[PDB]
Structure 1
Amino acid sequence: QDKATDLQSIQDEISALTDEIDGISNRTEFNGKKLLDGTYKVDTATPANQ
């Protein structure tokens, strides 16, 4: 029922909320630690970098 125009609008909203989620995973610099850096603690199936 909606249009590509309307869904372009919603998609603008979802990119806003998107970079807000990157915002949570980034702004969480606790004592300088980007803890919600997904990189910070990945098991990686190796002890190369955890």
Structure 2
Amino acid sequence: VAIQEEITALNDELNRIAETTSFGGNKLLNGTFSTKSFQIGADNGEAVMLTLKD
């Protein structure tokens, strides 16, 4: 029971890290950062897709 108490508390921490990690308000690890492209070229259509899994 003692061990479980801590495991439950740590379980919460995992979820808190996921629901809080934010790059300026854009949460990163709540499954909301669906695949996004980052433009890396002077001409259009030169972007790589970055996906942040939940």
TM over 0.5: yes
The two structures, once aligned, show a CA RMSD in angstroms of 1.5
User: Could you list the runs of 5+ residues in structure 1 that have no partner in the other structure?
Assistant: 1-7, 43-50
More helix per residue: 1 or 2? Answer: 1
Greater length-normalized contact order (CA 8 Å, ≥ 6 residues apart): 2
- Segments of 5+ residues of structure 2 without an aligned counterpart are 36-54
- Moved segments of 4+, more than 4 Å: none
TM-score (norm 1): 0.57
TM-score where L is the length of structure 2? 0.54
Higher strand fraction: Structure 1 or Structure 2?
Answer: 2
- Using the aligned pairs only, state the percent identity: 47
